[PDB]
Each structure stands twice: as structure tokens, then as C-alpha cells.
Amino acid sequence: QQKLTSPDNNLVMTFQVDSKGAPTYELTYKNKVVIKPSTLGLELKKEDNTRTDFDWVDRRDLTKLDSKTNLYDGFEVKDTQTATFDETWQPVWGEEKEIRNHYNELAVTLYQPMNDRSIVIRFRLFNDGLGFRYEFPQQKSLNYFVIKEEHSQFGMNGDHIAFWIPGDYDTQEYDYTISRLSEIRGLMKEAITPNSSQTPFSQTGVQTALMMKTDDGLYINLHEAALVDYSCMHLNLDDKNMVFESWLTPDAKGDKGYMQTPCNTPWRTIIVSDDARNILASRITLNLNEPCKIADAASWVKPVKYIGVWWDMITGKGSWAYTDELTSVKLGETDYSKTKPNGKHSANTANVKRYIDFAAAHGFDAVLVEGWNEGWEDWFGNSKDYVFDFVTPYPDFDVKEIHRYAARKGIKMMMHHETSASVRNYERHMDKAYQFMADNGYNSVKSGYVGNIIPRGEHHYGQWMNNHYLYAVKKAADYKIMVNAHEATRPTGICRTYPNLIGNESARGTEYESFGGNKVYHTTILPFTRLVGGPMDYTPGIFETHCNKMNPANNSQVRSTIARQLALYVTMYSPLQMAADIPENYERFMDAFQFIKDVALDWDETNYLEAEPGEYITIARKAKDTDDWYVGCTAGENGHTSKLVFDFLTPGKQYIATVYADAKDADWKENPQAYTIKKGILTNKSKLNLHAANGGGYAISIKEVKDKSEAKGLKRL
Amino acid sequence: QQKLTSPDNNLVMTFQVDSKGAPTYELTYKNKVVIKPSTLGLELKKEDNTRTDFDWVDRRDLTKLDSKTNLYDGFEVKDTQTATFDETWQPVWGEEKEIRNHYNELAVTLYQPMNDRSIVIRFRLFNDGLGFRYEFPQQKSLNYFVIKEEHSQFGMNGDHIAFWIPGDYDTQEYDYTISRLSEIRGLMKEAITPNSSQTPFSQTGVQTALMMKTDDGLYINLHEAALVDYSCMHLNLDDKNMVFESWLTPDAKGDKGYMQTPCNTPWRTIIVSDDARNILASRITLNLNEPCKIADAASWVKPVKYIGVWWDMITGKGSWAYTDELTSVKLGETDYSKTKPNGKHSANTANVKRYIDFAAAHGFDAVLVEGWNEGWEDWFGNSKDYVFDFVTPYPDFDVKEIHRYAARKGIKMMMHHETSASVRNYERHMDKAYQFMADNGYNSVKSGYVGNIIPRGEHHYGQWMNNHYLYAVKKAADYKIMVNAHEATRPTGICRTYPNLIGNESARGTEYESFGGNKVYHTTILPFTRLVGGPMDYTPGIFETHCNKMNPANNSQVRSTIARQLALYVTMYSPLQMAADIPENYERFMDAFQFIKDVALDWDETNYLEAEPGEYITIARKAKDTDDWYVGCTAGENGHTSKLVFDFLTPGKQYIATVYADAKDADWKENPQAYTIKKGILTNKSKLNLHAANGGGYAISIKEVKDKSEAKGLKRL
Numbered sequence A, B: 001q002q003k004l005t006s007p008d009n010n011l012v013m014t015f016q017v018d019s020k021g022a023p024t025y026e027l028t029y030k031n032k033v034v035i036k037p038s039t040l041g042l043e044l045k046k047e048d049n050t051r052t053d054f055d056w057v058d059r060r061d062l063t064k065l066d067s068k069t070n071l072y073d074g075f076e077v078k079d080t081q082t083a084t085f086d087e088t089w090q091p092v093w094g095e096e097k098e099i100r101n102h103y104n105e106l107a108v109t110l111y112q113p114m115n116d117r118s119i120v121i122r123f124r125l126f127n128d129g130l131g132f133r134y135e136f137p138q139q140k141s142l143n144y145f146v147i148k149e150e151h152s153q154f155g156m157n158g159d160h161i162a163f164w165i166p167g168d169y170d171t172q173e174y175d176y177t178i179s180r181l182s183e184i185r186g187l188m189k190e191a192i193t194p195n196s197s198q199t200p201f202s203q204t205g206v207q208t209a210l211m212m213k214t215d216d217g218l219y220i221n222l223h224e225a226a227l228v229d230y231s232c233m234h235l236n237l238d239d240k241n242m243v244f245e246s247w248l249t250p251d252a253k254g255d256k257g258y259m260q261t262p263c264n265t266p267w268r269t270i271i272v273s274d275d276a277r278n279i280l281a282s283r284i285t286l287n288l289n290e291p292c293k294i295a296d297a298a299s300w301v302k303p304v305k306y307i308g309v310w311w312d313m314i315t316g317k318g319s320w321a322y323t324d325e326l327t328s329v330k331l332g333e334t335d336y337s338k339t340k341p342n343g344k345h346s347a348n349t350a351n352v353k354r355y356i357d358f359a360a361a362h363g364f365d366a367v368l369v370e371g372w373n374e375g376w377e378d379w380f381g382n383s384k385d386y387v388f389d390f391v392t393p394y395p396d397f398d399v400k401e402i403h404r405y406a407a408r409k410g411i412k413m414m415m416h417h418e419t420s421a422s423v424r425n426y427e428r429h430m431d432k433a434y435q436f437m438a439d440n441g442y443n444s445v446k447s448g449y450v451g452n453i454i455p456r457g458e459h460h461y462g463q464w465m466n467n468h469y470l471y472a473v474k475k476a477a478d479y480k481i482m483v484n485a486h487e488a489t490r491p492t493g494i495c496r497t498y499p500n501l502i503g504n505e506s507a508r509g510t511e512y513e514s515f516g517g518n519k520v521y522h523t524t525i526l527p528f529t530r531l532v533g534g535p536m537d538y539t540p541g542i543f544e545t546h547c548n549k550m551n552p553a554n555n556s557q558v559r560s561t562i563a564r565q566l567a568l569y570v571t572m573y574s575p576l577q578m579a580a581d582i583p584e585n586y587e588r589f590m591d592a593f594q595f596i597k598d599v600a601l602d603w604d605e606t607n608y609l610e611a612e613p614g615e616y617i618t619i620a621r622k623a624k625d626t627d628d629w630y631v632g633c634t635a636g637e638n639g640h641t642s643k644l645v646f647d648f649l650t651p652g653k654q655y656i657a658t659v660y661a662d663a664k665d666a667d668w669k670e671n672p673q674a675y676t677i678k679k680g681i682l683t684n685k686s687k688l689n690l691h692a693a694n695g696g697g698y699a700i701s702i703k704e705v706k707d708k709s710e711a712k713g714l715k716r717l
Ligand SMILES: [Ca+2]
Pocket: A486, A487, A505, A511
């Protein structure tokens, strides 16, 4: 047996091969079993019965074709290597200024006599978790191979409580379900709600990052890191033995990965602690990704706070389309200048300029505009190939005028590249599209992949599409363009390597609050799941929570109080933050809007004050390069009472604190717009009791006093 | 019923809708049945049961979802329109200076009550055949649809003799089989030989252009024209009732075409005559294609006679790869400058310069070089995605020096873009690849798609790939680049619309003469099948027919005599002609090589003197802008005796004729290099008796005397 221990001795990973040569590992935390003996390995696709060289001669051993499919047992430990790593690095943007990468490593070389080939399984043990991956060295016996299935197991020590969404190859926009592992099977049917593109794979399949809470006080998170040149990993539960196992996303032919040595699988991670706050504080995912590959990133990659012509179309008040009189359109043939405007097209110059005015007046960085280009008439569900060209504006969208105006106002326009899931079409137009952005002042783009993937047969999270998503990001970096990709595979920390990937949706966002609503506890779960691996463009900030005010036919209601929406700018971390409501609605609650105007986007420090998945999350962050702090609390269906202790503030300093909280009897459903704002003085000796209503929360801006003229007339809170 | 007659009254097409509302047509030639009553129509893929708009509301008639799949019956004639067209046009390059487009047309509008939608079937009847297609007007009830199967029938009046190759979605590189329609089923297994990428679909499936000969003296050719934005059509035979039916190529999900109205299917053609020579003379395929879309085509599109560093690798004498010491390579990682040359890499500067020297010395236009770029080590059968970058040369290939040297010699280098069937990879690199060509003096490119298509699941001839092949040609046109695409879907006359597509292989070429050989009668069939729709880069000109002389491990023998190889420059039409052997071998038979040096590539007139599929083809062509004629005869297994009458020559003129013929004892197998060359005078009163040996033929250059001094010493032949 091989034993690996964490730097603090709290975690121990034991490895060995069983009597049939199957790699097996187990993990304990403070003497408590986290991962029971679980096997590791893969099954490879069998080679063609007949495969000939160019000279029409098959020189292969046809007697070993079946044996070659086995990459899961028959292994012998040939060699082992250990090492310790302890270095700190600084992210371009993040929750803290510096991240420490400290782990003890064990690399096991496994030789498989029957196939005369070897692989390496590398384990890295941190004080907050374990990460492992398979490595395939270049060798005479292993070069090109196809993965049939990966068989990485994660054996649970009990019937834990899980916070999960249905395993799916095409969408992650599902509401979370909280249940025992043994209850997943019976709840799967109702957990799978309708979506434009979805492919569930098992009655007990779930997506990662998967969050769990054990009966013996532990919090466990299962996920992956550095998903590159490989298919996305989901988890399939054996609910008899309570074992989760890797289930990769198949391509159009059912295969799960084309490999060429030397190559590695992404890392698989088990983050664990007896303190839920430590799950949020873990940086294992980022630490397992390759260091930044954009040498000059710091010079152009920057956080973005924005508003946009968007909610109009999401709610149904306005449209992305320019005209309604065409049964379909054909780019390059349809003459839009001869079509009749539907009178609902929000992406028109005059309206866009009004948004620019608002953004500039309130200190925002950019304005997003959707529906600016030809083609939106057919954007939804037609499996249309030549759906957009990403460069031709509608008759009522003056690209140059809008650029000139935005620039004069100190605002940047955020480009929108909805692809309607037509991927070859996007790649064919990508260089021209990025050049168009460069030529017209756009340095950030929100992309999208709504609908079933084209090439038809592929899924959103297969190896093929993962290659596309990264290709788009790498090409964007060459143009010094930042990317926010919706519908893409959920993040796994690749932002460390390519900091220009400032966001993804890849989970159920605020848009669904207009499609029936999101569960009240949704934002008390996302940080423990979706946010592990990268930020989310959740688009918070809805003040008029009744969608019927935007569109009479839309009776959806946002499940939140105004105060909780403010809190999300702190509890839903992201260097990309949108104030999603329309300008006129914010102008009706300008006193509350002040927090959105004040809140920072990048941080030097983050303190997770309180955290319990599905119930509440309270976070305090220190704005980068400042002595100012921002606090936010988001609560579930039962609300939450906080007894805050501001001892994290600097001793001897005075702070101007503004508390935005739920008013008495506030309620996400019956009284969402009831809030109070209190301004006073805070110090590291201050203590405050605040109550977050059901589906409520609170936000606090804490600015260091710079001139004594600020604390005039203010009292200690 | 409706009646449509050819301009000369010889052909009659009768159209009618039967009792169940199914469109039906029949065709007669000189009162003989060519096509028995056959139905026309298509079945569409059923729409998903639950499809919703963006508002989450299904606005469809769930009761109509089943009847909407029917686009084959329940029709009624709503309107009919007739018209006559008679115009002449001039191809940029071709077999004659002018082509006449003369037909009588009948357009039938068919309304389908149950689905409240209409389609149009347009028929065009020429003196040599019928063409028809389906048209789908844009209408409220027909916009986006997917084709399940096309059901275009071609009912035969008997058990004809057919010249066919196995129906296949991935290759056409099969030898032809000559048999009765009733014998196809029993011969299919042996007809399907091994290939790098192949997907047969039926025991009675064959490909088009399909050629047949009837017992009542007719020659019938079934094919299609203008295969654009649609899947390739093959034919499936009902060998019980002798009915051929359209069988389209499926995509990765099994579907056969994504359509969007207004749209049309390609044309389906039936070329018929009681004289086989008239099948070769038909221009129906080109006439049914859209007029030229390259405005300045005449200024840059030009025929090309070339040689190349190619046969070396095909025979195994040399290699495409630079080194043999690596199990695999990774572009951007593998440092070739540090690898050991295998000493077999033919694409090296010095060797290339020698080819350029030979090309310039003998009047050739270009030199093709394969194996010039990084990556060839892994080009075959690995289903490798990032296989080539199309721009990085190997250490021993000096791009700039070769460019300078070729330019100095008045030679152009032909670029080689083998993609190894990795299509997304080629598209991602295409603009840079074409720009590289432009920057380095390459104005023509030979592309290739060897291996199973990537995206994996697609076939070489599906709608997806057809889009790619045309995309490559259209983009090339923007760079003023000519394209010769191997492994692409066989031509259907699109060269009329895009004249820069100067070639395709898309059939069994000379390369297979090194892989065991082609059938002796192969070239007596290709003009009746493969050449209908476009020229072929057959790469004739092999003088040393024993491949073991290039590589001792290769015992393949070219099934031809030297004289027949010369004939192919006239009998295998193409504006792109290669002299495929190595310079050293041509230097052994320089007297015979003279014909290859003299023969033209473009023609003002073509006279098909003799023609019988599978037995012999004799053609005389007048070189464009000259009074010179070139003649070629290719024969099958039994040879052929020709009694030539040169009355096509101009009265009163004298011609210097050189006859390259098989020796009396010549034989493709036992005595292939035995030939005679006779030079003399020819006039329109001349008559010559020539015999083509088994697998032999002959070639004749007939140059008009410009200066009497050139005829001195010459006698009449
Ligand atoms: Ca979305």
C-alpha cells in the first residue's frame, strides 16, 4: 500500500492495486472515511477488425484486440514518485490577491503486462481535498486510442444529502434538488424540466460539481479541473452501494474521447471539510490548472460592470427580431431595408443611446445589446446552419454612431454573438467577427449556443465542443478580446490559464426568473456547485420582480427581495456583473441602486462569514487596492438571522457603513420591495444583528473614512 | 395528363398524378420506352412531438404532425406552365467553344390539400434527354423541413446491361463491373473491394452517373446535376421490378437533408440515345447548372499541364514523411529540425528543383509536390484532428527558394492540401492556407480527404460535406485560386458556375494501378460515367508500367500499353493533365513523350469518332484557337480496329501528322512498351487503319502546315 498525507496531516489517501490489478484508492479526513475503497481505470474502444497501412498490409496482433480494450486492471505498481509543492501566485482577477498552491504529491506508474503498456496516476493532496488524474505516456504500445468509458469511482460512506441537478449532455439550466442519495432516482423525473436542448442519460445521473452534506458533519464536493482536450465528466450513481462513477459525454457515434499520447485526463477532485465555509474558500480547482498563458493579460483583461438591452427580450416586452412579417430569412438575400419594423425591436440606436446615458451617469463600464444583427427572426430551434454572420447590423442599429457615442461617454459596448448552436457557422465567421469587434471598439463578447448543436449529433459538452469553446477563447485572446460564453460547458478553472474567459452562464441564471422563476434557495447553492471552477454571469439586480410589469402576458415572478438582489453582487462572485433591470425601473429605487453603483468587482481578500448550502451564505470582501469592504447575505426559504462581528476591519480605523436590508415583514413573494437603508459608523468593535427574510438577504458597503467631513452627523450602528 | 416533347419530336415525357395523388412520369425515345411509369416525391422527417417557441408555448397542430411527413402523394395539379429555351454559351474551358442550351419545359404546380402546401416539379426535355427537379416555394406551411428519403423513381423497361460501381457514402474508387441489372446483387460482395473509407448501403445499390445498354439498342445514363445544398444521390435497385430509386446520403443522425424554402433539389437526369457517341456529346448536365458566378474568371482560370513529386510516394519508392523515428507527431510540439531524415523524403528542395528543370525544359505549366509540410508521419487512418496546418514546411523544403526558382523557369508550383479527412481542421486553417499560397506564388491546389470524415459520423458525400467542398471552392475563388479536389463528391456540372473547380478525382484513378491495378476496360467506361458532370484528374502518362521498378516490394502492373497512356490525354478529358511518371522514365522514351508535350488541354471542337462502353472510345479534338487536331483511342480487353476517316479536317489544307500506335505484338500485360511512331502528311481525304492492342490504343497529333518547309521529305500517310 502507498500512503499520501496532507500537509496538516488531517487527510490521508491510501492507494494499492487489488488481487486482479485494479487501481484502488481511499480517502479519510480527520479519521473519518470520505471516499471508501474505489477503483480507477478506463475501458477503451476496440480497434477495427481490419485496419491496413498505406501499403495495404495489417501488421497488428489480431489476438490482442480484446485485451487492448482493458485499461482498468491487470496493473502492477512499477514505480512511485513523491514531491511537495508550495508556491503562491496572483490571479489577474479573483476573490483574493494571492492564492497558495500547497500539496503533497504521489505519482504511481502502473504497468500492464498483458498489453505491454503503462500509465501514471498522479495524486495531489491538499489540506482541503484530493485531486487525481490519469497520464498516458508516449510509448510503442500506446499512441492513438479512443475512450469507451472512464471508470473513476467515488464511493460514499453513507446516504448523504446532496444538492444536485440532472446529469445532461446539453444543459445545466435546471433548478437544484436537495435530497438523500437514495432519493435521487425517484426525484429525477420531476427534476428534469423542459429545455431547448437537453439529453439526460440516467435515472441516477447528476452533474458536477456535486455538493453533499454527511450525517457525520462533513461537506464533500466532487468535481473536475482543467477540462481540456477531453469530454465533460458527469457522475452516475449506483444507489445500492452508494458509489458515484465518472460518466463522460459521448460524441455523435457514442464514443467518449479521442486521445493521442502523451496526454492526460482532466483532474478529478474531492474537496472536503467539516466547515462548509472551507468548501467555498478552496482553490484546489484553480491550483490544478496550468499557469496563465496570456503574457500581457494584466494589461488588457479587466472586470466589467454592465447593463444592457436584454431584459426587454427575455421578458417578452421587446424582441430580438427587427420584423415579424417574414416566415423565415436568408442572409444575403433578405433585404431588411424593405421589411416593416415590428415596433418591438429594442436594439435601435435611440434606445441604445439612452442605455449608454444611464450607464455613463452611474459609473458602469459597458452596455450589452442583443438583437443588433441580421438573422434573429430565425434564431430559435430551427437547427439553422447559416443563421448569423455576426457582422451585419439591422437597419435601425447604427454601429458607428453607437460606437462614437459610447466612446465619448466613456462606455464600452459589449458584443453579442448568439450562435443558435450553429458551430461550424460561427467558426467560419469568427475571424471576421472578432476583426469587426476590433474595428468598431468592442473588446468583450457575450456568446451563446442556444439549441441543439450543429454539427448535428454532437452534444454541448462533448470533446468536440469543448475544443470549440477553448478555440474561441484562445483566438479571442489573440485579438485582446474577453469572452463570456453562455450554454458552454461549465467551468473547471481554465480561467487561470486564459484570464480572458471572464464568464459563462452554464447554469440556471436570472433569465429563468422570467420563465417561471428559480428556486428560492438557488443562490445559496450555486457558490457551492457552479461557482467552483469559475465565475458566473448570473445577471442579478432585478428590482421590479413582477414580470407582468414588463410584459402583461408574463406572470413569472423573481423569487427574491430587492435586498437579496443587492447581496448577490457579493455572494455570487464574478469579475463580470450585470445590473439586469431596465433603467426606468432602477430610477424608481435609486436609493437601493446606490449599492450596485458602489460595489466593487475585484477583491484583495474574501472572508466567508457564514455558509450552509441551501440555507444561507454571508460573505465579506475587501475591494482590490482599497480599504473598503462589501458584505452580502443571501438566504433560503426560511430566511436567516446573522450576528455579524466586524473584527475583520482594521483596528483604529473608522468606516462609513450603509446597510441595505429587508424591512420588517419583507418576503420574496408577498412583499419583495420592502427594504430599509441605514447609514452610520462602523469599526472593528462593531456588532450588528440583521435578519434576511424568506428569499431575502442584505448588503453592506463599508468605506474607510478618508476625510473627517464624512462622518459628520453619523452615529455608530 | 400532360405531354412534353423534345425539340426534334423524338422524345416524349408524359406526366400525370395517379388515383392516390402521386406524381408520375414516363419517357419514350423514338417510340421506345426508356422510363416506365415512375413516381416522384419525398418523405419528410417527423417534427418532434414537443417543440416550443421562446415563450414556452407550442403553437402547432399536433394532429398534423403525422400527415406533414407525406410529400409523395395526395397531390392535385393546380397549375402548369410551359416554355422553350434556346441559347448558346461559352465555357471558360471545355470540349468545345460553344454549348447550346435548347429544351422545352413543363413546370407543374402540385397542391396537397391535407397539408395545405404546394411544390413544383420542373421538367426540361432536350433532344438527348430529360432533366427534372423539385422546387419548394416559401409558404406559410412549408419553411424548414428535413428530408427522410427522396423517392424519385427510374423504372427500366428491361434487364439492361449496366456499367456500375457499388453505392457508397464514402468512396467511388472501385473498379467497374459490367453485368445485367439482375446480376448486380450476386456480384456486389466481390465488387466492394477494401478502401480507407467506405460505407456501402445496399446489396443492389449503385452510384451515379450510372451507364446502361438495352437489348433494343438504347444507351441510357442516369445521373444528377447541380448538387448544391443537398445530399448526394445514389441509386438503389429493386431487382424484382427493375426500378431504380433515389437513395440520398445520410448525415450522422441518419437524416437526408436540411431544407429551408425557397429551395430546390438538384436536377435528376436521364440521357438517352441509340448512338453511344451521343451520350458523350451530351451537355445536359452542364446546361442544368447556374451560369458562371466568377465575373473575372477568364482573366485567371487557365488549364494546367503538370508533373510532380508524387509517383515516388504512391509506389512506395519514397515517402511523404520527413522522418521514421517517431511513433506520432504533434504540430507545434514536435521539433522536426531535431529528427533524423528517413532518407526517403522526396519533397526536398534539390529534388524539387530537378522536377522544375524537367517541367520547364519540356513546356509544362506546373509542378505538384506532396509531402512538403509538417505532419505526414500521421496522415493515414488515425482519425487525427489537428493533422496538418497547411503552411509549415519540413526542414528540407525551402518554400521561398523553390518559388524563386520556379518563377525563373516560368513554372508555377501546385499546392497540396491533403486534409486526411479532418474537415474542421482544414476550415480553421483555410484562410491562412490560401493566403500562404497567394504569398508564395501558388495559384492552384490539389486537396484531399483520405480517411473517415471528422466530424466523426458524417460521410464524404452528405449535405454537410457537400457544403464544405463548395465552401472551399468559393473561398478559393476569392483568392483567384483553382481547385482540384480528390475524394470529394463526384462532379455534377458545378464547374459551369465556378470554373475554378478544374478537377476532382472522385473515381478510381491511376494511383490504383499501383495498388493492384485498374481493370483493362476502365478508361472505356469513365467517359460514360464519371466524366459526366466534370473532368477527372486521372493522372495518366505512366511509361514504366511495372511498379516493381520503383519499389521492389510493389508487384502491381499498370494495365495499359504506352500508346494507350498517350491516348488518355485525348480520351480522358480534363483542363488539368498530369504526366505522372518520373522524369527518368520519360527520358527513356522521349520519342513517345513528344505527344504528351504537344497535346493541348482546351478545345474549340470535339468529334466522338467511335464509342462503345467497356470496349473502345476514339475521339478527335481541335485545339482551341488553332487549326490543329489531336486524336486518341483507348481500348478494352479485346483491343480495337479503327478505320479512321479524316474528313473532319479542313478541305485544301495540309497537315503534319504523327501517329503513336501499339506495335503489332503489343499487349498491356506481356508487351506494354512496344510502340511505333510514324510522321507524314494528312488531308481531309486521308484514311487510316489502326489497331489498338488488348489494353492498348493510339494517339495522333495533326498540326496544320504553316510553312511549306515543314513538310519537306514527308509523304502522305
Ligand atoms: Ca441561457
